[PDB]
Design a protein around this motif. Sequence first.
Motif, PDB file in Angstrom:
ATOM      1  N   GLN A   1       0.829  -1.203   0.000  1.00  9.82           N
ATOM      2  CA  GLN A   1       0.000   0.000   0.000  1.00  9.82           C
ATOM      3  C   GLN A   1       0.865   1.255   0.000  1.00  9.82           C
ATOM      4  O   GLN A   1       0.592   2.239   0.692  1.00  9.82           O
ATOM      5  N   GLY A   2       1.931   1.207  -0.792  1.00  8.43           N
ATOM      6  CA  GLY A   2       2.865   2.311  -0.853  1.00  8.43           C
ATOM      7  C   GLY A   2       3.754   2.179  -2.070  1.00  8.43           C
ATOM      8  O   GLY A   2       3.636   1.241  -2.859  1.00  8.43           O
ATOM      9  N   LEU A   3       4.650   3.147  -2.206  1.00  9.88           N
ATOM     10  CA  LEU A   3       5.543   3.203  -3.348  1.00  9.88           C
ATOM     11  C   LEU A   3       6.619   2.126  -3.236  1.00  9.88           C
ATOM     12  O   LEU A   3       6.942   1.648  -2.147  1.00  9.88           O
TER      13      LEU A   3
ATOM     14  N   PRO B   1       4.688   4.036  -8.517  1.00 12.58           N
ATOM     15  CA  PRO B   1       3.362   3.655  -8.004  1.00 12.58           C
ATOM     16  C   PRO B   1       3.036   2.185  -8.197  1.00 12.58           C
ATOM     17  O   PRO B   1       2.449   1.567  -7.302  1.00 12.58           O
TER      18      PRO B   1
ATOM     19  N   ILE C   1      -0.350   0.328  -7.020  1.00 15.61           N
ATOM     20  CA  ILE C   1      -1.496   1.218  -6.885  1.00 15.61           C
ATOM     21  C   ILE C   1      -2.200   1.348  -8.225  1.00 15.61           C
ATOM     22  O   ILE C   1      -1.570   1.630  -9.251  1.00 15.61           O
ATOM     23  N   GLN C   2      -3.512   1.137  -8.220  1.00 15.89           N
ATOM     24  CA  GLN C   2      -4.316   1.128  -9.429  1.00 15.89           C
ATOM     25  C   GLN C   2      -4.944   2.502  -9.653  1.00 15.89           C
ATOM     26  O   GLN C   2      -5.004   3.343  -8.754  1.00 15.89           O
ATOM     27  N   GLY C   3      -5.418   2.725 -10.873  1.00 13.04           N
ATOM     28  CA  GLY C   3      -6.065   3.988 -11.191  1.00 13.04           C
ATOM     29  C   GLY C   3      -5.125   5.170 -11.164  1.00 13.04           C
ATOM     30  O   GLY C   3      -5.500   6.257 -10.705  1.00 13.04           O
ATOM     31  N   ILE C   4      -3.902   4.985 -11.647  1.00 17.55           N
ATOM     32  CA  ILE C   4      -2.921   6.058 -11.707  1.00 17.55           C
ATOM     33  C   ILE C   4      -2.773   6.604 -13.123  1.00 17.55           C
ATOM     34  O   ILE C   4      -2.582   7.806 -13.307  1.00 17.55           O
TER      35      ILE C   4
ATOM     36  N   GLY D   1      -5.521   9.045 -13.740  1.00 18.23           N
ATOM     37  CA  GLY D   1      -5.356  10.259 -12.954  1.00 18.23           C
ATOM     38  C   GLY D   1      -4.290  11.178 -13.508  1.00 18.23           C
ATOM     39  O   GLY D   1      -4.410  12.404 -13.433  1.00 18.23           O
TER      40      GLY D   1
END
Lengths: 154, 156, 156, 457, 67, 67
Positions: free
Chosen positions: C102-104, C140, C143-146, C149
């Motif tokens: 849940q992070g970079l 990222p 992490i999804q949805g980047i 964005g």
Amino acid sequence: NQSKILTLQAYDPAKVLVFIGGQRVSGFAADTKIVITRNNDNISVHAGVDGEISNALSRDNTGVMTLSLQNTAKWNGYLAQWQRQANVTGLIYLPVQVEGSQGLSLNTIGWIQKQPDLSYGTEVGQMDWEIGVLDAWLSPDQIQGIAAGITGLL
Amino acid sequence: NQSKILTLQAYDPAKVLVFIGGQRVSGFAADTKIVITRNNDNISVHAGVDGEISNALSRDNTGVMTLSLQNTAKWNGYLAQWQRQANVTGLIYLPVQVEGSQGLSLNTIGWIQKQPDLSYGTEVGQMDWEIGVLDAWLSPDQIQGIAAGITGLLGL
Amino acid sequence: NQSKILTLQAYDPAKVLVFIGGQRVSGFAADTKIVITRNNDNISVHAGVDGEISNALSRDNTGVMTLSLQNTAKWNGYLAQWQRQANVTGLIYLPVQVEGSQGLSLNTIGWIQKQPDLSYGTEVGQMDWEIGVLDAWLSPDQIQGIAAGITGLLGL
Amino acid sequence: EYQDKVVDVEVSLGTGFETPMFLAMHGNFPERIRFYVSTAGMVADGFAVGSPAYQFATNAFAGNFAPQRVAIGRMSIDSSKVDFTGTTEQVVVNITLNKVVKAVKINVGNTPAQIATALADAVTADLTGKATAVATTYVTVTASPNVVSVGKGAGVYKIVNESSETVATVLPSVIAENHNWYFLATEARSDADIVAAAEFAKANYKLHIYNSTDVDAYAPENSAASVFDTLKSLSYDSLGTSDAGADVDFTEGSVIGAMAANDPSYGDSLHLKTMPGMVPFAGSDTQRSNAWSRNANIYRGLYGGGSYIEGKTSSGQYVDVIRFSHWVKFRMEESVFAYMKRRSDMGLSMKMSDEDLPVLKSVLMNNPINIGIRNGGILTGYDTENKVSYDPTIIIPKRANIPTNDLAARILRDVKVELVYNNSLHYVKIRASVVLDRPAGQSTNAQTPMSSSAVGV
Amino acid sequence: DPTIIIPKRANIPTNDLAARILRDVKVELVYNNSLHYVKIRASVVLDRPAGQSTNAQTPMSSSAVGV
Amino acid sequence: IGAMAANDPSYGDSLHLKTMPGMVPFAGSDTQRSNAWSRNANIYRGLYGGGSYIEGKTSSGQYVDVI
């Protein structure tokens, strides 16, 4: 002036139902049953030297709900198994709803925060599971009446 | 004199809106959302040889804006992707706006200055982005009764 | 607005995987596993003589990675042997990967910078290895949805 | 509704308060009170430019404290008289049948009689066959059911409307109608009319403002021959001021423009405020003193600007005090009334018992009092000469003291409040001193100065 | 805020107990509207920005006269 | 009637200052108001922007809340 009874129905502790994950919890200990407390003050005040004062609204509603249960209740094993499963997989959030008899209520999402100590002695002991809640705002849904608009000469 | 309430409605941290590129930013952490500061003073003073004081206005107005976020927010990924794209192509300038509540506000063009440092520990960590801004003059804007007050000050 | 949970599953320190050379590393200590930081800022600003601001992107991307271990872990011996071998022959570059939860995350090539200091005391001590890395841009990745964005940000 | 443009952008280039009421003589509408928000609204209703109503409206909106809404009273007009007395192109603006702007013109021995008859001749068929004009120094003009308006356009002449309807009877009619107005003004500048309006104003708790061109205002202090004398002798309160242009443009509006938006809670005086539209008073030093004793305020120019002076009323009381008292009354009964209504709407109406009467302390301290303390209108603290405090006090009767009769009638009385007013500053005196050789020396007595004499017998 | 109401066993008609049906459960919601059309009122000055009065007092919100 | 149907008399509340949604304020000067009062003819009167029903005296003179 004559003394007045407040509520026409007595406060029955058995009507204070606790729902965690959709199941009713049974096997509570003696004395207290549910303790709900916040974590920080609702409004903070910045006092000035001259006399001017300004206030700020807290945006954090984290709270801790304490459940007291006997050592012989199956819900202790339920909570231990849930703790182990949440640890191995990762999902730790479950719904929590508390319905009051003649008081305020609560309905948010909670999680297991601290496990209690386990003592063994001559008498049957008590274990207090500490459950944390996302928001600790108590709701007056059961009471009927809308006077908040009426009150207030601000 | 007696005590007095400075305002009528309380300052609310959630009412402070931060916009970068055109999207509101969510995921702030700890007890400090943003910090806006300048780099140089507005006026520098010089002493003379016979008591005269000469003042010189500064013509540099750049500043810094520290954004504190949790390392579980998607805006971290957004900023990282933007940084990589800016390095590859060259476009680095994006608009920045902060709408304060019962306080001063900001509206200028900013850029990403320095990437923070991750720290994986027992608790959830905090990442602080330094965003540099072209102009750092705070604007009264929402506060009313300022135009009349400005003309009231005397000076010679 | 009301309160909101940032994620769905909790951040777990054991889920963070650290790979050096191709083997997972175990033996972390205290309350800080790894710390990733850069050496220089991404952009340096210069003031002008008539208010212009000129920005220059940096072309250096090296960084440091502090690894905290107990002095009872075999990876201490592994690193010491690697250091001796590198000094004798010359090969110093090995791959480094960190998969955050849940992070970079990070994926680059690293090297051993500075050997820590032992301290035999009453309690069990802590040794901190500085590992330098070529590129220190966090990705990222998980992490999804980047991608969507990134194209949403406006700027001119 | 249909909108072709998703985003619409129209470009343009160059671009509550206490409303007054001006009682004019006219017939442009059947009602007796109408509210206008700008002079552009008055012209559409057939008001001639430069007419008494038009001049009053434009002055009011030009002040730093404009009301942003004005009321016009209506009185029947039987004749209008244009006087050319005094030496003087002379354009007279006229509007007839609310459909034409007949700006007749004259050009001019040069005695008034020549222009007096000349304009009357020009009025004939200058269309104009729906009105009449007869000469005599001045010309009489009359309408037939035709709206006729006359307004000054140039020259020295003045407009004198006439009507058989008496002010003393009209005012009750206009107050029976909409009563949302505070300042009272009129154009019936006869001596009787001013007194009648003043008497009515104090009975209904309005504020009466008027201007006078009478020369007797600043006549010697022993001579009482002006309106100012009569009002003063009757102990009325009215803000009368002496001006020369009052009878041409009705500069009452300028005074109101400096008070409509002025909140009484600040205790702000009318002293030294600017009056856009008035002219500096030209009298000598002695004349100013004569007017002052008359309680006839003047607009005097100092150091290039213009400034009102002393704002005193007819009875001698300062105007700000008079305004403060009205503000306390109006905004004290309102707060109590509002609280009572809220209780009754919930069904829990107030009841005369010791358990609820005390609440009125919180209500009164809320709206009228605390607002008056932040702004400095109301003094507080402790005085060491009187050795008396200045804090407001409130007393409320208990159920044991209410006479049985009032219980039947449901009336509560004897509620008592106490306030202290904060005075502004008007005049300051300085005592400078210029040394030439050496600053005055002082004794080397470094002992603390004793505050009293030991011998006391 | 959304509200939910659930009948209690004392209000269920005897017939529904035989048929095993629960009804009269009530919910309440509020829908959030999007934005479709926007209008602007621009103004271009030529000589001087419009001046304002020097009245630095707080603007009163109501008229004292109310009768 | 809309302001009395659900008002149980046990609270002793009256019709003074209650709001009637649909009536129009009385206009007749002030003396006309005096004449109506002696007539036991109640009026709807507007004050401070709103409308308020003044006194519910019945034809005989007794207050309505008592009846």
